[PDB]
């Protein structure tokens, strides 16, 4: 037969499942809502473990739990009495013999060592991927610190004593590759002249490479907690998602400067020189899956300054027109091809993050907190899962390097970048704007002819990598 | 077949915006949601007897990605130009968006609808009068909604799509 | 894209987690941090073919013992790894393998033998013993480094052929 349990009067994990408590959708069970009590209990289940659950949980329990609560609830859970022994084990003792205690041992071995453990696996969880909670409550800290720091028994040592040094090593807180990773490319300007790089002197391939760097290095920087709650939407959101917005001022400086590039070269050949190279590193986007520089592109193409230079793009070749044209559809009937692709590629690659950002938004705004049921309010854990679904997704994404070499100076050029300079934001798009009218004014006003003002050769070296010995 | 609606919804982030799509595509009397699913954002409906297609582009959260704008905006028929009641900076970023659509569609006619959204129970500070007045300065219809009541949803999309018919 | 979920099973201390984290991250993990149970996720082409591997990282430790049931109900193929300076860890291999095999209920469970830490040069079981092993169950024998990376996506992938040809 089944164990028997603890009286629920003594500890709350043991109050039988009931619709007032739990509901589950329709081969571990998956919980569509059910009381705080009842999600702690099966987030450290004793009959088998769901290591996706504690993922969804440790990512999104703060809408409905305080940091503080569950660290008392979960030490709660921890603290399971012993059953009393047996009267088969009364009369062993009566006679001065030991008894067999045979229920106590398996209460033990299939009841409180696997709830523990697993509790233990939570507070685990907790420290290695949400160890923001306790830089935010040093007091929190203390009590995981004091309750890990004080459990005693011989089954847990191991673990509570990995868990103490981990605390300690977060608290004071390399790569390896299959291959070696491509020559970085030079084209006009050579190694340590940072004072003529540009978008025409930098070797398209390069500026790629490097961008593709950046916009990695902040795409994974991010972390769920900038997101949950939708906290980027929100009036802290420089306090509460500083890396993600980072990350997509990133990608809006480097589509105004593609766009002030364009738009700032007067003389038409020169002109159609620009928008040649910049689809040329829209390629080389491409070919490295970084989704975020190919959308970086479209943007800037389909701008209001840029996407009505009817001379310019009528002369650039048909091969480049279907580039940009096949990374536009992309974006179409709302990212369909752009989400079948992401999907079939193989990574490293950099996602775009608004899809996400929209997604998380509206699965947050569309859903309700609570279920209400006989009475009850059930926290709405569906929700929770959903929203935990799409942070799992960007964080695989996360998880590969690019085994691409990072060029110092050609790094800090783009880091630097600031096409606004000291202008706001209307000032400036408008001057972009204005500009676009300058160089290729609206029918029926006649199209005038403008100085070169490069002063350098205008060909490309083309987007095929080269291979010295 | 019948005809196909692209309607795009504009307007500042993080007061509620985008309620307004949700309220409509929503299983009216399931409160429930997900926007991940293929066509969560396309319903068919009857206005005025005549049964047509809505095809919304809500891009609520990616309002950081300004560079952006331009090429959502261009793929839009018709606007839902949405502020706050209670946030008057959402009321005063109005103008700009409208400006925006206008160059983005270069037409100083473009199908759109002024809406103003309550999102919660904090203190209006928009009043009727104030949008009213802005509305009649543009030319266009003004429709007030609520984010939980479902009120003024089916109006201000149904109003937007006979302002399109009616170009 | 079709999903694989995959189980890395083996004695504490012979690099489950060490490999796992090189697979998924490309870096190695220097500390011996005893698992309880951690599960990862990997989008990856294989043989031209885009698939998501599930991986679960379970306890070696003999105080996890009893909390096995469980994840070999769940998993569809199995990566059985011991350390080739460590004869106890390989000797535990045989004890994995039975019970995968009566839990599934099943003689053809997708498997992998993995002899890892091939990096260090004071090896104690020999490859022959482990490859006469790995003949008499029907299943390849991968020498693996979570610490230079040799032999880890052959480990892995070809678990994942084995899944995919069951
Ligand atoms: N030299 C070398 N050391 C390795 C290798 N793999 C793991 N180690 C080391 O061996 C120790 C244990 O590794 P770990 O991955 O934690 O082993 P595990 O099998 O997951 N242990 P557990 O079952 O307790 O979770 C660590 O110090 C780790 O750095 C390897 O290929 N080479
Ligand atoms: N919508 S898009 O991103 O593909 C795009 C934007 C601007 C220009 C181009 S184009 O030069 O390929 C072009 C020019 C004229 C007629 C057809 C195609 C494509
Ligand atoms: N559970 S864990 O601590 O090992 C962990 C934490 C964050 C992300 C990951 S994951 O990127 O491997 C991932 C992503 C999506 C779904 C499952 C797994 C693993
Ligand atoms: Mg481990
Ligand atoms: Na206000």
Same mark, same amino acid.
């Given at each position: 037969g089944q164990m028997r349990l603890p009286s629920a009067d003594v500890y709350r994990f043991a109050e039988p499942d009931s619709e007032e408590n739990i509901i589950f959708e329709e081969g571990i069970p998956i919980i569509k809502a059910g009381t705080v009590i009842k999600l702690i209990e099966r987030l450290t289940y004793h009959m088998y473990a769901d290591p996706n659950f504690v993922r969804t949980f440790l990512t999104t329990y703060r809408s409905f739990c305080k940091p503080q609560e569950l660290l008392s609830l979960i030490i709660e859970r921890f603290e399971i009495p012993e059953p009393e022994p047996t009267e088969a084990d009364r009369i062993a003792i009566e006679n001065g013999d030991q008894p067999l205690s045979a229920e106590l041992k398996r209460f033990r071995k299939e009841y409180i060592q696997p709830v523990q453990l697993r509790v233990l696996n939570v507070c685990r969880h907790w420290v290695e991927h949400h160890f923001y909670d306790f830089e935010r409550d040093a007091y929190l800290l203390q009590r995981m610190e004091e309750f890990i720091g004080t459990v005693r028994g011989k089954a847990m040592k191991k673990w509570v004593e990995s868990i103490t040094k981990i605390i300690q090593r977060k608290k004071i807180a390399n790569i390896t590759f299959q291959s070696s990773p491509p020559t970085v490319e030079w084209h006009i300007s050579r190694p340590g002249? %940072? /004072?003529?790089?540009d978008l025409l002197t930098l070797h398209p391939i390069e500026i790629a490479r490097q961008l593709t760097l950046l916009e990695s290095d902040l795409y994974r920087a991010v972390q769920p907690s900038e997101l949950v709650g939708s906290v980027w939407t929100k009036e802290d959101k420089e306090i509460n998602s500083p890396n993600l917005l980072k990350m997509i001022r990133h990608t809006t400086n480097l589509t105004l400067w593609f766009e002030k590039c364009i738009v700032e070269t007067e003389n038409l050949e020169e002109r159609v020189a620009v928008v040649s190279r910049i689809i040329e590193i829209l390629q080389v986007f491409q070919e490295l899956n970084n989704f975020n520089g190919v959308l970086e592109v479209v943007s800037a193409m389909n701008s209001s300054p840029v996407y009505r230079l009817d001379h310019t793009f009528e002369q650039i070749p048909s091969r480049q027109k279907k580039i940009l044209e096949e990374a536009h559809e992309l974006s179409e009937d709302h990212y369909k091809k752009y989400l079948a692709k992401l999907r079939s590629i193989n990574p490293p690659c950099v996602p775009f993050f608004g899809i996400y950002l929209t997604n998380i938004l509206k699965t947050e705004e569309g859903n309700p907190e609570v279920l209400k049921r006989h009475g009850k309010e059930l926290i709405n854990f569906s929700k929770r899962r959903k929203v935990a679904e799409i942070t799992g997704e960007i964080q695989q994404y996360q998880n590969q390097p690019y085994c691409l070499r990072v060029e110092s100076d050609i790094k800090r050029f783009f880091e630097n970048?600031?096409? &606004? *300079?000291?202008?706001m934001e209307k000032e400036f798009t408008d001057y972009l704007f204005n500009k676009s009218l300058e160089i290729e004014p609206r029918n029926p006003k006649p199209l005038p002819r403008f100085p070169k003002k490069y002063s350098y050769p205008l060909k490309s070296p083309g987007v095929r990598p080269s291979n010295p010995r | 077949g019948m005809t196909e609606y692209k309607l795009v919804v504009v307007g500042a982030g993080g007061?509620?915006?985008? @309620?307004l799509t949700i309220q409509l595509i929503q299983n009216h009397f399931v409160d429930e949601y997900d926007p991940? %699913? /293929?066509?969560?954002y396309r319903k068919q409906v009857v206005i005025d007897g005549e049964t047509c297609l809505l095809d919304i582009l809500d891009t609520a *959260?990616? /309002?950081?990605?300004? @560079? &952006?704008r331009d090429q959502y905006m261009r793929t839009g028929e018709g606007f839902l130009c949405v502020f706050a009641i209670n946030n008057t900076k959402s009321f005063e970023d109005i103008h700009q968006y409208r400006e925006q659509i206008k160059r983005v569609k270069d037409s100083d006619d473009v199908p759109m609808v002024l809406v103003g959204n309550k999102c919660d129970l904090a203190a209006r500070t928009v009043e009727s009068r104030q949008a009213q007045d802005l509305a009649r300065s543009y030319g266009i219809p003004y429709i007030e909604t609520s984010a939980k009541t479902r009120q003024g949803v089916e109006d201000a999309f149904y109003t937007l799509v006979r302002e399109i018919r009616q170009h």
């Amino acid at each position: 037969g089944q164990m028997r349990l603890p009286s629920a009067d003594v500890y709350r994990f043991a109050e039988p499942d009931s619709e007032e408590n739990i509901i589950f959708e329709e081969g571990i069970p998956i919980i569509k809502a059910g009381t705080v009590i009842k999600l702690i209990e099966r987030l450290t289940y004793h009959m088998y473990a769901d290591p996706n659950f504690v993922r969804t949980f440790l990512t999104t329990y703060r809408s409905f739990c305080k940091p503080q609560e569950l660290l008392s609830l979960i030490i709660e859970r921890f603290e399971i009495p012993e059953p009393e022994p047996t009267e088969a084990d009364r009369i062993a003792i009566e006679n001065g013999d030991q008894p067999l205690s045979a229920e106590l041992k398996r209460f033990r071995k299939e009841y409180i060592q696997p709830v523990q453990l697993r509790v233990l696996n939570v507070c685990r969880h907790w420290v290695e991927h949400h160890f923001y909670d306790f830089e935010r409550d040093a007091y929190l800290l203390q009590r995981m610190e004091e309750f890990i720091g004080t459990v005693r028994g011989k089954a847990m040592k191991k673990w509570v004593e990995s868990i103490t040094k981990i605390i300690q090593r977060k608290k004071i807180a390399n790569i390896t590759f299959q291959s070696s990773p491509p020559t970085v490319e030079w084209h006009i300007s050579r190694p340590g002249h %940072i /004072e003529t790089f540009d978008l025409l002197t930098l070797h398209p391939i390069e500026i790629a490479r490097q961008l593709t760097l950046l916009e990695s290095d902040l795409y994974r920087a991010v972390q769920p907690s900038e997101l949950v709650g939708s906290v980027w939407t929100k009036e802290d959101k420089e306090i509460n998602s500083p890396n993600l917005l980072k990350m997509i001022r990133h990608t809006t400086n480097l589509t105004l400067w593609f766009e002030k590039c364009i738009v700032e070269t007067e003389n038409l050949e020169e002109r159609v020189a620009v928008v040649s190279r910049i689809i040329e590193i829209l390629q080389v986007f491409q070919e490295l899956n970084n989704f975020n520089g190919v959308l970086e592109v479209v943007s800037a193409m389909n701008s209001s300054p840029v996407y009505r230079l009817d001379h310019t793009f009528e002369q650039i070749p048909s091969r480049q027109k279907k580039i940009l044209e096949e990374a536009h559809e992309l974006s179409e009937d709302h990212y369909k091809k752009y989400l079948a692709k992401l999907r079939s590629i193989n990574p490293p690659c950099v996602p775009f993050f608004g899809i996400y950002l929209t997604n998380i938004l509206k699965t947050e705004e569309g859903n309700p907190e609570v279920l209400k049921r006989h009475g009850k309010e059930l926290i709405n854990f569906s929700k929770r899962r959903k929203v935990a679904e799409i942070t799992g997704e960007i964080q695989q994404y996360q998880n590969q390097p690019y085994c691409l070499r990072v060029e110092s100076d050609i790094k800090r050029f783009f880091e630097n970048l600031n096409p &606004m *300079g000291n202008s706001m934001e209307k000032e400036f798009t408008d001057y972009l704007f204005n500009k676009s009218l300058e160089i290729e004014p609206r029918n029926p006003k006649p199209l005038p002819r403008f100085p070169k003002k490069y002063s350098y050769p205008l060909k490309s070296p083309g987007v095929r990598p080269s291979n010295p010995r | 077949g019948m005809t196909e609606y692209k309607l795009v919804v504009v307007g500042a982030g993080g007061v509620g915006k985008s @309620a307004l799509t949700i309220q409509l595509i929503q299983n009216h009397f399931v409160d429930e949601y997900d926007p991940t %699913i /293929e066509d969560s954002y396309r319903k068919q409906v009857v206005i005025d007897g005549e049964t047509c297609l809505l095809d919304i582009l809500d891009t609520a *959260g990616q /309002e950081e990605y300004s @560079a &952006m704008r331009d090429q959502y905006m261009r793929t839009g028929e018709g606007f839902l130009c949405v502020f706050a009641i209670n946030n008057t900076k959402s009321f005063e970023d109005i103008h700009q968006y409208r400006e925006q659509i206008k160059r983005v569609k270069d037409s100083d006619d473009v199908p759109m609808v002024l809406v103003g959204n309550k999102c919660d129970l904090a203190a209006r500070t928009v009043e009727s009068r104030q949008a009213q007045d802005l509305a009649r300065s543009y030319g266009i219809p003004y429709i007030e909604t609520s984010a939980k009541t479902r009120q003024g949803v089916e109006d201000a999309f149904y109003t937007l799509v006979r302002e399109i018919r009616q170009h």
